[PDB]
Amino acid sequence: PPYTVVYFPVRGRCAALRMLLADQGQSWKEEVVTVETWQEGSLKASCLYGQLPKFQDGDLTLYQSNTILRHLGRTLGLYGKDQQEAALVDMVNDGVEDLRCKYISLIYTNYEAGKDDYVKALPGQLKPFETLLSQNQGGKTFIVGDQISFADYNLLDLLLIHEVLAPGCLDAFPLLSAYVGRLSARPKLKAFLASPEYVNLPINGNGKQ
Amino acid sequence: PPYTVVYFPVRGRCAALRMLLADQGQSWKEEVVTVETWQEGSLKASCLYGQLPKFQDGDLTLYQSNTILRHLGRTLGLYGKDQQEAALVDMVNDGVEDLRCKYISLIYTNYEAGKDDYVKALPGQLKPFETLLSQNQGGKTFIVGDQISFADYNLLDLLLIHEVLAPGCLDAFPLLSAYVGRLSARPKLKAFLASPEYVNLPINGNGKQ
Ligand SMILES: N[C@@H](CCC(=O)N[C@@H](CSCCN(CCCl)c1ccc(CCCC(=O)O)cc1)C(=O)NCC(=O)O)C(=O)O
Ligand SMILES: N[C@@H](CCC(=O)N[C@@H](CSCCN(CCCl)c1ccc(CCCC(=O)O)cc1)C(=O)NCC(=O)O)C(=O)O
Ligand SMILES: [Ca+2]
Ligand SMILES: [Cl-]
Ligand SMILES: [Cl-]
């Protein structure tokens, strides 16, 4: 295959791009990095920002999960129908990235002490996405416009992991709830989500979710 | 156009996009929001993610600083020559964003106790950008390719604020040092950087830098 994903054995910041690749019927290779191989130091020192994921598209070596998403969004036509839609797609993805950073902080730095406050603040953090859906064809299609974008796969992942963290958190958000059901039912994506390559990886690397 | 920037009276997350507009000879309106006006709650409630900056481009309203940069990048041709370069531009911008988030965390949440460790870690955080320069025309043009991109304005701002936090932090990095001097001397940008509109705003909102 022309694509390779280089990452720890976790869903994490590769879950959305994997969903995108599977739903778009693309082939790729998974190169798995163990904690031990990481600790040896050589791979880390060779990574641009000392971190994973690393992604290869032929001889193009990328880092940064959102860079990978935008690159696939460009090359596979998942980035809006025009320049204005592309901006809206970026606006959604940046909002998803902001919440994901908060989620990552909770999971890895403050799970015990922070979980109650986080879950209390969650409706206010999810509401913008419900608002975006409500303003786009009554929430019946995608997060921007009438075709899927890379921001849909990232938002979907963000919602899926939040359902595990805070079961029922989308009960307050009918359009988000229906949206998760709808996208999750896309045949190639449904198959991927049920498959061992997805199900047998943990969401995060520290046993918390 | 026309362009409107809605923000607090600080450089912060609008510095790069202002540098971009000035350097590109664009006109814009600053809509300054005071802390007092923000605390009233009304503008905040109307903001997609309850935050500034907000940006207007004719009938298009955007939020998210990097969405604004990418939109200006796309519409003004500051996004590399092709898709491969666009990906590289995103990779640089996402690395700038990661370090900006670290800088913001330090400034706003942990300056006194955290500055020493931050400054000790700083060389390892800047080196990737020196490495990128070294791999592109010997560092003699821009961060990606042969034309300026939105990532250059964001990296330039990141470098400038880091020189204030940690004077001498570029001294070990000749390509970054030369790059800052070169970009800063571009006539319109030089004029902007010297102007009261830039000089008489604080970098951050809490008196720290
Ligand atoms: N802005 C970047 C951020 C990427 C990022 O933050 N990557 C981190 C986080 S990667 C996911 C967390 N992680 C690394 C911890 Cl050091 C990790 C996750 C899963 C496993 C395996 C599972 C272990 C288990 O379940 O017990 C091991 C490590 C990383 O590479 N850490 C290594 C380092 O900085 O030295 C992006 O968006 O790509
Ligand atoms: N991912 C987003 C992040 C945007 C963001 O973090 N914006 C914040 C940070 S804006 C800069 C910090 N700030 C707001 C703190 Cl209430 C602020 C900064 C400067 C001043 C005035 C300066 C006073 C002075 O020292 O002279 C007032 C507020 C914001 O709007 N906060 C307000 C809120 O959430 O209610 C993006 O990139 O745009
Ligand atoms: Ca150009
Ligand atoms: Cl992660
Ligand atoms: Cl800021």
Curated annotation (Swiss-Prot), chains A, B:
This is Glutathione S-transferase P. Its main location: cytoplasm. Residues 82-203 form the GST C-terminal domain. Keywords: Acetylation, Cytoplasm, Lipid metabolism, Mitochondrion, Nucleus, Phosphoprotein, Transferase. The modification Phosphothreonine is found at T61. InterPro entries: Glutathione-S-Trfase_C-like, Glutathione-S-Trfase_C_sf, Glutathione_S-Trfase, Glutathione_S-Trfase_N, GST_C, GST_pi, GST_superfamily, Thioredoxin-like_sf. PANTHER family: GLUTATHIONE S-TRANSFERASE, GLUTATHIONE S-TRANSFERASE P. The modification N6-succinyllysine is found at K102, K115. Conjugation of reduced glutathione to a wide number of exogenous and endogenous hydrophobic electrophiles. Involved in the formation of glutathione conjugates of both prostaglandin A2 (PGA2) and prostaglandin J2 (PGJ2). Participates in the formation of novel hepoxilin regioisomers. Negatively regulates CDK5 activity via p25/p35 translocation to prevent neurodegeneration. Belongs to the GST superfamily. Pi family.
